[PDB]
């Protein structure tokens, strides 16, 4: 929304094969790391565990 409101002219195509992230897990709170590949699978696990292929 910002890139289309202020810098109107470009198209922010979405992708997954680049970048990283810091997954804050939680006895202590150890923050993990996901390189834009395991974010979707871990999010689906957060929504509901006991999944498969």
41 binds other proteins (CB under 8 A): no
Six token digits for residue 34:
């996901």
Helix (H) or strand (E) holding 41: helix 39-47
CA distance 34 to 24: 10
37 binds other proteins (CB under 8 A): no
27 binds other proteins (CB under 8 A): no
CA distance 39 to 45: 10
28 binds other proteins (CB under 8 A): no
Q: Which residues bind other proteins (CB under 8 A)?
A: 1, 3-5, 8-13, 15, 18-26, 31-32, 36, 39, 42-43, 45-46
């Amino acid at each position: 929304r910002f890139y289309l409101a202020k810098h109107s002219g470009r198209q922010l195509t979405l992708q997954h094969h680049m970048g990283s992230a810091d997954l804050n897990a939680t006895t202590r709170k150890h923050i993990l790391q996901v390189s834009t590949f395991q974010m979707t699978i871990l999010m689906l696990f957060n929504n509901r565990e006991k999944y498969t292929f």
